[PDB]
Motif scaffolding. Structure first.
Motif, PDB file in Angstrom:
ATOM      1  N   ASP A  12       0.584 -10.285  -4.070  1.00  0.00           N
ATOM      2  CA  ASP A  12       0.180  -9.008  -3.408  1.00  0.00           C
ATOM      3  C   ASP A  12       1.561  -8.599  -2.927  1.00  0.00           C
ATOM      4  OD1 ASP A  12      -0.421  -7.122  -1.415  1.00  0.00           O
ATOM      5  OD2 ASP A  12      -2.542  -7.853  -1.010  1.00  0.00           O
ATOM      6  N   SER A  14       1.588  -5.294  -1.310  1.00  0.00           N
ATOM      7  CA  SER A  14       1.561  -4.202  -0.515  1.00  0.00           C
ATOM      8  C   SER A  14       2.181  -4.049   0.768  1.00  0.00           C
ATOM      9  CB  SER A  14      -0.066  -4.184  -0.195  1.00  0.00           C
ATOM     10  OG  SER A  14      -0.603  -5.156   0.370  1.00  0.00           O
ATOM     11  N   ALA A  15       2.729  -5.241   1.291  1.00  0.00           N
ATOM     12  CA  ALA A  15       3.519  -5.262   2.618  1.00  0.00           C
ATOM     13  C   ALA A  15       4.869  -5.328   2.502  1.00  0.00           C
ATOM     14  CB  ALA A  15       2.865  -6.610   3.464  1.00  0.00           C
ATOM     15  N   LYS A  18       9.072  -0.726   0.190  1.00  0.00           N
ATOM     16  CA  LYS A  18       9.494   0.117  -0.933  1.00  0.00           C
ATOM     17  C   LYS A  18      10.730   0.879  -0.796  1.00  0.00           C
ATOM     18  CE  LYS A  18       7.425   3.474  -4.094  1.00  0.00           C
ATOM     19  NZ  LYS A  18       8.908   4.371  -4.044  1.00  0.00           N
ATOM     20  N   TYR A  24      11.284  -2.834  -4.799  1.00  0.00           N
ATOM     21  CA  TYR A  24      10.794  -3.504  -3.597  1.00  0.00           C
ATOM     22  C   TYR A  24      11.469  -4.637  -3.039  1.00  0.00           C
ATOM     23  CZ  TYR A  24       6.564  -0.764  -4.561  1.00  0.00           C
ATOM     24  OH  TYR A  24       5.750   0.245  -4.817  1.00  0.00           O
ATOM     25  N   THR A  36       6.357  -4.355 -10.901  1.00  0.00           N
ATOM     26  CA  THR A  36       5.469  -3.949 -10.074  1.00  0.00           C
ATOM     27  C   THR A  36       4.349  -3.110 -10.689  1.00  0.00           C
ATOM     28  OG1 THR A  36       6.578  -2.234  -9.443  1.00  0.00           O
ATOM     29  CG2 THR A  36       7.075  -3.917  -8.307  1.00  0.00           C
ATOM     30  N   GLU A  38       0.157  -1.152  -9.939  1.00  0.00           N
ATOM     31  CA  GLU A  38      -1.263  -0.971  -9.254  1.00  0.00           C
ATOM     32  C   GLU A  38      -2.328  -1.718  -9.738  1.00  0.00           C
ATOM     33  OE1 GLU A  38      -3.904   2.710  -8.812  1.00  0.00           O
ATOM     34  OE2 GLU A  38      -2.942   2.654  -6.670  1.00  0.00           O
ATOM     35  N   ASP A  40      -6.646  -2.657  -9.540  1.00  0.00           N
ATOM     36  CA  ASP A  40      -7.837  -2.381  -8.699  1.00  0.00           C
ATOM     37  C   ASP A  40      -8.886  -3.352  -9.108  1.00  0.00           C
ATOM     38  OD1 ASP A  40      -7.904  -1.645 -11.560  1.00  0.00           O
ATOM     39  OD2 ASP A  40      -9.203   0.029 -11.381  1.00  0.00           O
ATOM     40  N   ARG A  54      -7.536  -0.341  -4.033  1.00  0.00           N
ATOM     41  CA  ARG A  54      -6.181   0.149  -5.104  1.00  0.00           C
ATOM     42  C   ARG A  54      -4.864  -0.723  -4.299  1.00  0.00           C
ATOM     43  NH1 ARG A  54      -6.131   1.475  -9.442  1.00  0.00           N
ATOM     44  NH2 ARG A  54      -7.391   3.096 -10.652  1.00  0.00           N
ATOM     45  N   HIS A  55      -4.296  -1.782  -4.950  1.00  0.00           N
ATOM     46  CA  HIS A  55      -3.527  -2.581  -4.204  1.00  0.00           C
ATOM     47  C   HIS A  55      -1.937  -2.585  -5.071  1.00  0.00           C
ATOM     48  CE1 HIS A  55      -5.069  -6.051  -5.566  1.00  0.00           C
ATOM     49  NE2 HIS A  55      -4.003  -6.666  -5.263  1.00  0.00           N
ATOM     50  N   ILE A  56      -0.976  -2.574  -4.542  1.00  0.00           N
ATOM     51  CA  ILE A  56      -0.029  -2.991  -5.447  1.00  0.00           C
ATOM     52  C   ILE A  56       0.846  -4.548  -5.495  1.00  0.00           C
ATOM     53  CG2 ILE A  56       1.685  -2.559  -3.369  1.00  0.00           C
ATOM     54  CD1 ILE A  56       2.626  -1.853  -7.031  1.00  0.00           C
ATOM     55  N   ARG A  57       0.904  -5.035  -6.808  1.00  0.00           N
ATOM     56  CA  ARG A  57       1.095  -6.293  -6.878  1.00  0.00           C
ATOM     57  C   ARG A  57       2.634  -6.578  -7.685  1.00  0.00           C
ATOM     58  NH1 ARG A  57      -2.802  -9.536  -5.681  1.00  0.00           N
ATOM     59  NH2 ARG A  57      -2.137 -11.482  -6.823  1.00  0.00           N
TER      60      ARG A  57
END
Ligand SMILES: *[C@@H]1O[C@H](CO)[C@@H](O[C@@H]2O[C@H](CO)[C@@H](O)[C@H](O)[C@H]2NC(C)=O)[C@H](O)[C@H]1NC(C)=O
Ligand SMILES: *[C@@H]1O[C@H](CO)[C@@H](O)[C@H](O)[C@H]1NC(C)=O
Ligand SMILES: *[C@@H]1O[C@H](CO)[C@@H](O)[C@H](O)[C@H]1NC(C)=O
Ligand SMILES: [Pb+2]
Ligand SMILES: [Pb+2]
Length: 188
Positions: A12, A14-15, A18, A24, A36, A38, A40, A54-57
């Motif tokens: 993950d 998301s933190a 960007k 990232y 990278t 998104e 779900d 919905r998160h970015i991995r």
């Protein structure tokens, strides 16, 4: 979703910061945008899909080696359950090193947290896993840098969906010590 990346090779992000060019910065690692995507959904023990925000991995395991953990880096596995109770003492006396076999066939000692990316948000491989104590002759195993796990007893190869490593308390005769041990599914 991420091009040519198995879900179990993702983390993950998301933190992560960007950047401008779209890539990232994940915990000091530069992750290109192409690696990278998104998500779900998150695969579960049965290899089915479930929904999640919905998160970015990011497919960081293709950039730096990953270690397939069962829980967060500072948790201990207690009879199959992730347990956040390590005292500062245990954190200090525990053995943070993993023996990883490289592609040239050699063995390298690697710090689980500093030299590898700990994957901890993956689904538990199954309920009631057993652990290997490689001090016993039947429990020997090989852990390759690329994520492949090989159990010597029955010479079976397990992928990241079928095993996970975690700090665990072992008995030292009449004392106690913490080392990282692999957990497998008995029948799954
Ligand atoms: C990860 O590394 C393992 C071991 O280096 C690869 O599996 C080996 O592949 C060779 C190819 O001929 C086989 O002869 C060995 O028997 C395999 N070993 C085991 C334990 O399965 C594996 O293919 C690598 N994975 C990736 C994605 O490259
Ligand atoms: C984004 O910027 C960093 C430095 O800030 C650079 O190293 C990286 O290569 C850039 N991203 C791409 C895709 O070129
Ligand atoms: C790695 O190998 C060393 C040396 O043989 C051994 O003492 C240690 O228990 C191994 N580490 C783990 C986590 O099993
Ligand atoms: Pb304790
Ligand atoms: Pb055993």
């Amino acid at each position: 979703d991420i091009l040519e990346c198995d879900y179990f090779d993702t983390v993950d992000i998301s933190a992560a910061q960007k950047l401008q060019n779209g890539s990232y910065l994940f915990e000091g690692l530069l992750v290109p945008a192409i690696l990278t995507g998104e998500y779900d959904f998150r695969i579960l023990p049965d290899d089915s899909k479930q929904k999640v925000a919905r998160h970015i991995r990011g497919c960081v395991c293709k950039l730096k080696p990953c270690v397939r953990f069962c829980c967060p880096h500072d948790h201990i596995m207690d009879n199959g359950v992730c347990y956040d109770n390590m005292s500062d003492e245990e954190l200090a006396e525990l053995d943070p090193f993993l023996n990883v076999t490289l592609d040239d066939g050699s063995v390298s000692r690697r710090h689980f947290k500093n030299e590898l990316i700990v994957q901890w948000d993956l689904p538990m491989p199954c309920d009631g896993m057993f652990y290997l104590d490689n001090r016993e002759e039947q429990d020997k195993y090989t852990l390759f840098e690329n994520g492949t796990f090989f159990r010597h007893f029955d010479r079976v190869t397990l992928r990241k969906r079928e095993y996970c490593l975690q700090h665990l308390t072992f008995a030292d005769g009449n004392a106690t010590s913490i080392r990282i041990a692999p957990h497998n599914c008995l029948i799954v």
